[PDB]
């Protein structure tokens, strides 16, 4: 078959075992949708992501789009637009969109164990099938005539762009200097270049594109707060009818040359600069820029978090399928005897090693995402949980920053360990493991580099939100500690020390912070440690969600679990203790080291590196 | 300018302040080489490799090169040929070469400190240029015949290879079936594919290939020990005259699409399969095939970590740059205020921990090589360690596997901090970084994988020494512990890394005697033994930049200024940086490595 390598079974585990989101379903919103039904959707785009969908991952790196600079537009290889017409002749661009705008209504936490099949197969399909996903945030940030808007780009498959990013204003948003030129008759002139832009041109994919672009009204303040967002389509149309008319004055002016996702195209996009105005329209006629641009934001690093994460899960699988044929070496019982038999490399330790590494994380990550997932929902959140809809809100923000930056580096970090598995082979293009990594790098960079997912999830998501939602995760953690059954005792106790050690990271970099008033150099020493910080949450998070699913694994393991299930639920037990084990201990170092950082490094003078 | 930004200033700092390797230079086998000349040849080829040889870095990997099935031959790109003839027209490829092949005689710390800038700028080129080497490899093997054709080659220099993988012999080298058939005359007809052999056809750079062949004799016995090594050349030739005849039935089938390396050939290399058979010559006439082999494996080893380290150096200097000049936000004193100036992302607390971690492991990875070169030749190593020649090659040994493994793993985890650093823009071809990336991750597999170096490392390299050349290093170590405030805490915070370190060793052997009784504990040996080789590296590390720190000091006191300070500077950061952030993990690292058990040895396979 292909490269990807689905898990469907984990989902499910994850899904009803464990999380328990059948509860909704079958009622309310979700009326018309089953549990059978949830299992049957899984099933099917799982197949269509090793089919179809994967059959041209080789295909879009090896023969990367080509930019028509006098056309301003990119042709995109054929093999990969038959898989995305396969994605929209299935309506799986359409998954977890409102009923109102064609979509069928689901929990998010299934929308994303959906999505996380198209990601691990060919992520920039999804990328460029997120049309549809936008026109609804349109939706409800946008007037009633916009909403009309919306409601045609959604109906007819319009592709989509966040459009953020200039050559001086990338981690700091609110140095752009695009501007917006307001019309007698309300419109707006965007005038300015923007670049890295994602999907900007799409060859003929779709009828339209709808730009959404940050953008200072002329005589508007400084900062995030000083922009304003704008609807700027490719072409105009008829308010009325979606028909397609004059070509709009925002052009693609370069495509860029990546390491890896090549097959997404990465754009310069030019507004107002080839003597056709760029028209925009103000978003809800309202200036609220960076906050109506961040609700875009806060689902493309999830979403980015995600595609990391299905990433290593293909590439652990792939690593593992080969080991179990691998062979290689005699049993290490008997290396001393060259006459021995030849073994599979799953006989041998460090592989054993390298490969539980990389399940303990495919699967803690797997956990997070599909955690931070069931607080998406208020009804979810009150039938798994039992939390308000405001707390939801608070916890979701607050995993958004791991399921992002840990989930991103923590992927790329285990392919490693997925390529290292394959020896010599691993290094060739034959095997898909070196795309997984090359593709995989940016997720650390695009959506907010890891930097500044910490100081989010430190600054916005601890300190703004006083605590709240970390002192409820938190609480989840110690009732499962505290609720011994002594079978995971020695987890528990692991648990009971990793978690110690990232209360203490807390009140020390917060400590660092409320000392910033006094001596303002003092808050340095929150940016030194701030993604460590961040690292170890999300490792704290990872054995704790595998803890609790060794305990569900337990359950149906003394209940008389047999066959491929009993196994399945084995190596649950046995990626929560190894990583109890063997990645929770190291945080009491990390605790140790934040609790004494200096600020040597801020004082050494810059010509000394 | 280049990609490839070098460091003749950090190269020169290890060999003269810290090790003092000109002490032997200006005198014996290094009598017309002094330090001056030693100095200015570094920045020659340094020069050499900024320029020629970096031009077609990019080249080789966006036109990488084409087997042609026509003619059995692989084809490069034009500027890459350019670039491997300004290496040679400067005679770059024989440095550390006997004199008696044409070579300079050097001591090995300052040859690896000019093989490195090869490395950095693009280190496929120093790979096809190990012909001369590799031919003294051979000279020294050989009989006296044989001495003849390796001057020959050595002189013509003839291009080489190292021919032991196949498809199912790779790790396991021992389970090698190419076969090995003698004839009337004494020659050998040897039989059999090999796989993934670098540079095993090389276009028209060179007049001839010596391809040096493990392979098994008929009726020899199984494993390593059953190997023999031929010398089999890709045209035959006059053994007086060096002359070029026949083809010899040796020939390319494939050139593997790799990740990175692009310009590299990695071929699949068949013999006597072709209708004409692969005549080799029994090296040595001797049958002795892995230790002869080994000779030239364990210059690859030092040749991978090298490289490793040197596109580690590269990769930091490039962030390093672009940070000093990227403008992007505000100080973070005034993250609250929108109106306060923007600043380069020198002064963001992320970016200067990311730079500084680069930094330390860069020099740490440096000053491991280079310490480990200071222990291959006799000479230096009674000079500058006071140790004779027994344990000097012990220790050698002892850290050959920490240069490659170690600086392998290393060099590519923290190439990931240097692309960081750029944001965006590191993901981009534009910049260098992202093919440092691909380039740099085949380190951790050729030349054995870090797991094989791992077991080299305990089992060879510490267990059957009697952990003699590790008790002398840990006692090195000590004695920078124990020896004479302004490195108080490093020191301290070393202590405790270096009982880390012992702790691991002991429950390492524990587990390896405990075998004695239950055959399975050995694996708890294999699931700790990588750890144990990292953590010894970062021990290596901490200790190599503190002993920087305390000359620094040194040079600080006697007066340093202006560039020279920053850098001594520099290197007190750096040793402060590292003890105070790496270090301590190793505790943790040692409390895992002592409670390991072998629940995921008895895990069934189908459940993972
Ligand atoms: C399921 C449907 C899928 C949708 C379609 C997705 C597919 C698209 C295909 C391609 C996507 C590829 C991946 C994304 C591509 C990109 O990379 S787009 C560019 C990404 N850019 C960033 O992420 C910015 C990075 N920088 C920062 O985040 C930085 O921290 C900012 C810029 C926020 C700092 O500026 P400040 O001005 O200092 O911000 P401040 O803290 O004061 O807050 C100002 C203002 O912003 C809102 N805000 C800030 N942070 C958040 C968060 N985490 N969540 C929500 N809102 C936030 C607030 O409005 C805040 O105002 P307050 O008064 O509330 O403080
Ligand atoms: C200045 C010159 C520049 C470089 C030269 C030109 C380069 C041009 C080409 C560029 C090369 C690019 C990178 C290298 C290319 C490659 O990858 S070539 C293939 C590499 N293959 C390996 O490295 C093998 C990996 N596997 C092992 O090492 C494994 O551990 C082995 C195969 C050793 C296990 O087999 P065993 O049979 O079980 O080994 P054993 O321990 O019992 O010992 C047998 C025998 O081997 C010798 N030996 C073993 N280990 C060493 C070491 N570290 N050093 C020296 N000798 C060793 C011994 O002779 C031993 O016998 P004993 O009686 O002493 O025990
Ligand atoms: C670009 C490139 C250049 C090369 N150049 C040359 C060259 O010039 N000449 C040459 O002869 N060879 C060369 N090689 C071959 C190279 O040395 C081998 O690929 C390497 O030794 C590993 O062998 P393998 O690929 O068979 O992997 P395998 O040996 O099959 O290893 C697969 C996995 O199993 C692990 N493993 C294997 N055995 C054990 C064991 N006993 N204990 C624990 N783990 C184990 C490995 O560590 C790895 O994780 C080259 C390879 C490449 C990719
Ligand atoms: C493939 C790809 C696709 C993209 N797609 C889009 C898209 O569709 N839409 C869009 O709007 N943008 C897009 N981007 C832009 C991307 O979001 C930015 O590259 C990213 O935010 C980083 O900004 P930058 O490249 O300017 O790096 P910089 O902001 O210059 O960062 C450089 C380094 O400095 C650090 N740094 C910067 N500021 C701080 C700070 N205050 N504190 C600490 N460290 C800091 C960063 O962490 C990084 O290490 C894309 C980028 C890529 C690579």
New binding site residues.
Partial sequence: MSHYKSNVRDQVFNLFEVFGVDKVLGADKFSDLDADTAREMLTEIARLAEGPIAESFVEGDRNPPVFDPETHTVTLPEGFKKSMRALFDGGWDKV?LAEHLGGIPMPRAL?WAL?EHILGANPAA???A?????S??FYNNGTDEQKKWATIAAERGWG???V??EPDA?????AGRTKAVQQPDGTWHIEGVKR?I??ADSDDLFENIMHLVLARPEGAGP???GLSLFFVPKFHFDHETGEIGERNGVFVTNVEHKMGLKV?ATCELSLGQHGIPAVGWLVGEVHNG??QM???????????GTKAIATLSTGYLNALEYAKERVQGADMTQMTDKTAPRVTITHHPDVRRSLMTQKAYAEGLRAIYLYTATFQDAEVAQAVHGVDGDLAARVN?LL??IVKGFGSETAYAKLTESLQTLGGSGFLQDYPIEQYIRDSKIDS?????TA?QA??FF???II?DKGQALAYVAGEIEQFIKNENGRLKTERELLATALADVQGMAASLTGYLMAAQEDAASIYKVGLGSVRFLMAVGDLLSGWLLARQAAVAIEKLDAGATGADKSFYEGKIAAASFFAKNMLPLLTSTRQIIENLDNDVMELDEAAF
């Avoid at 990338?170 to 609110?174: A, E, F, K, N, R």
């Avoid at 609700?295 to 980015?304: G, K, L, S």
Wanted: glycine share 14%.
């Fill in positions: 977890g929308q999505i999804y990328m460029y997120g049309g549809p996903g936008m609804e945030i989509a762009t966040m953020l990013t990338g981690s700091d948003v609110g890295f994602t999907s900062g995030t707060k997404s960076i906050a961040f609700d875009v934001i806060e689902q493309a690093r999830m979403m980015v923000d958004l920053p960079l695009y959506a907010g580099t500044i100081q989010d600054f916005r998501k703004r």
